[PDB]
Design a protein around this ligand. Sequence first.
Ligand SMILES: CNCc1ccc(-c2[nH]c3cc(F)cc4c3c2CCNC4=O)cc1
Length: 347
Amino acid sequence: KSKLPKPVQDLIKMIFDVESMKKAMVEYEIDLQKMPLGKLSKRQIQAAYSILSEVQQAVSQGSSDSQILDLSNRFYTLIPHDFGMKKPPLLNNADSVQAKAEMLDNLLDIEVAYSLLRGGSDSKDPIDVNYEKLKTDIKVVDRDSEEAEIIRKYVKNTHATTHNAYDLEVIDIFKIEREGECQRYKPFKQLHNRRLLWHGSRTTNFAGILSQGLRIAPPEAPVTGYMFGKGIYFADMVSKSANYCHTSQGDPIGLILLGEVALGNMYELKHASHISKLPKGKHSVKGLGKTTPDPSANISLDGVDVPLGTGISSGVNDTSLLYNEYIVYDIAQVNLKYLLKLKFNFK
Ligand SMILES: CNCc1ccc(-c2[nH]c3cc(F)cc4c3c2CCNC4=O)cc1
């Protein structure tokens, strides 16, 4: 019944598939009898974040084993897991809290997506119904267009040497514009240094990402793992962001984003720092990597500089980063331009 293009139709089907939501939850070890998709709520994930933040402070303070156990038990009581024989992994370190926090980041977007799906008027094709739910215009970029060529070159060129486990294939290029996002970004368009950068996420998140845009982790969330504090992270290297799709031989198709990001005065940093407050004058944070995209090969797509230069070496050898990463701490500093459907070819 829907007049929408097949790639768009196929995209709506994909980002709203309830089975891949459950499949994610199962992989996460969650008890689906006690915690089914429906019972999953914003308030419990908020509460769970808060417990993880407590576990972090308990680790920082170097609190009692009794404390860390009761704290760990409280988390698993809130987010019921099912290991069968295996005893629940004790949350008593940075990696443990970071891990569970990232799970919650995902569960939160899953809740966003499932709620969106269940909500609204219940005629009109369901694929059309759900496309409208995303409040995002999705248009297909022609395979043989100047646009597509620029994008595919950026994908080919900024594919790292280290990420040699896969080969990326651009199945579909979508030109997207989220409802009201353009007006939101318009004041930050006045800022200098507007770059077109990569953002990779699990497919289960993309309904929420298109629905509410990219967002920053709440206050409740632990500051652990966020190398440069809670903000929106980006890469000039397709590989770096493609990693975050969590693709496999099983599910080799993943989704990536191209977004206009107003960086302005970048706070160029070598090593990790949980910022919270940026220095007076600065608008973003640039994690300086040992490998930088060729600056002498920077292109200008719609008056936005695309660093599609081949992976060359940067002068900094005294850094904890292998590649460049960019962080903004105001969600309006981003305007999403493209969504790419990539096929990961493993070896
Ligand atoms: C606890 N979770 C911590 C955490 C989770 C995700 C990210 C992150 N850093 C990035 C740097 C970068 F350049 C690109 C990306 C990311 C991400 C995750 C989001 N996607 C990116 O492509 C960073 C920290």
